[PDB]
Amino acid sequence: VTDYSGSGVKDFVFEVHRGDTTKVIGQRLKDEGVVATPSAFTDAAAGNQAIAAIQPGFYKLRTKIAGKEAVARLAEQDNRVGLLVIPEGRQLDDVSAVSNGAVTEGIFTLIARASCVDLDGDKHCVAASDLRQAATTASQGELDVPDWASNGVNAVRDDHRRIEGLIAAGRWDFDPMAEPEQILASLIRESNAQYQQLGLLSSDAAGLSPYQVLVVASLLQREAKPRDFAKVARVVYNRLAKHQKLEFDSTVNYPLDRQEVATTDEDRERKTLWNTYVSQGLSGTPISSPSPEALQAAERPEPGDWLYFVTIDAEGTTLFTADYNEHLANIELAKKNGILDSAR
């Protein structure tokens, strides 16, 4: 049957849909002018495991090519485009290390990098600043902000940080040729489905909204090691109940876009929507994209009366207590064991 020869005509982005079989992909490849007949694709794909296991997503292909060439291009990992990984605890912005270490790239930078497609020579990317602007100004309906987050987003005006926490840690696909608003919206929709699957909307923890649970998880992700998440969650709720400020360093560092570092009394005094040295209560928005385990801890805090915690040694032991004098003793223990500076 008819099957194209030669090197093709035009590079473009092709989407494999969820539920597409090899046969259906062959039909769609014919309809988009990639292969001359569907069986040109399916014959060449027979017994190919890369094609059999192909994932829904976006793929750089070329028009008017041979079936075996279409198969090779689809099976080549490098032609995958709009595939994004957001590691746990990332922010929207890049975060500098004043610890003398390297920059930590944020979600905008990672989306932009994931968006790049080489089309007939032209490298085509969405720019991080365009994603940031769309986060700053697009309407909630345009970003598909979920209902449980609507009021939290609304209280933060003309700041991209209004959508913090809404793009979850995980692995996502997005159309690299769509507008910045639609890219952000699809990410937020996929994240909302994951958050639902991870229990964010169906939690029975008394007196907490889903948005508040997300905020707590984002704090835990930045302040504690995974082993301690559940206990730190209890500390947070105990302090909220006793109207004691959280005094989390990560809430000071978050808007300065800087990594885990000690904070001065000057920094702790700056009034922001997030600073928990200044104000009682939770941060106004999440301060990071939390891991699934931080979410589970925020939903199911370990029972206990602790109000204080500090890491005291090299192996990461963390002592929790409800007694302030014991907490002072544990702080000094961390200083003698070398973990914490003798003076701030």
Author numbering: 1 to 344
Give the published text.
One type of enzyme involved in this process is membrane-bound glycosidase, which cleaves the PG sugar backbone. Lytic transglycosyl­ase (LT), anchored to the cytoplasmic membrane, is a representative glycosidase enzyme that catalyzes nonhydrolytic cleavage of the β-1,4 glycosidic bond between MurNAc and GlcNAc to produce muropeptide products containing a 1,6-anhydro-MurNAc (anhMurNAc) end [Fig. 1(a)]. In a previous study, MltG was characterized as the terminase responsible for achieving PG integration into the cell wall through cleavage of the newly synthesized glycan strand.
The purified maMltG protein was crystallized and the 2.2 Å high-resolution crystal structure of maMltG was solved using the MR phasing method. However, there is a huge structural discrepancy in the various locations of the PG-binding domain, indicating structural plasticity between the two domains of the MltG family.
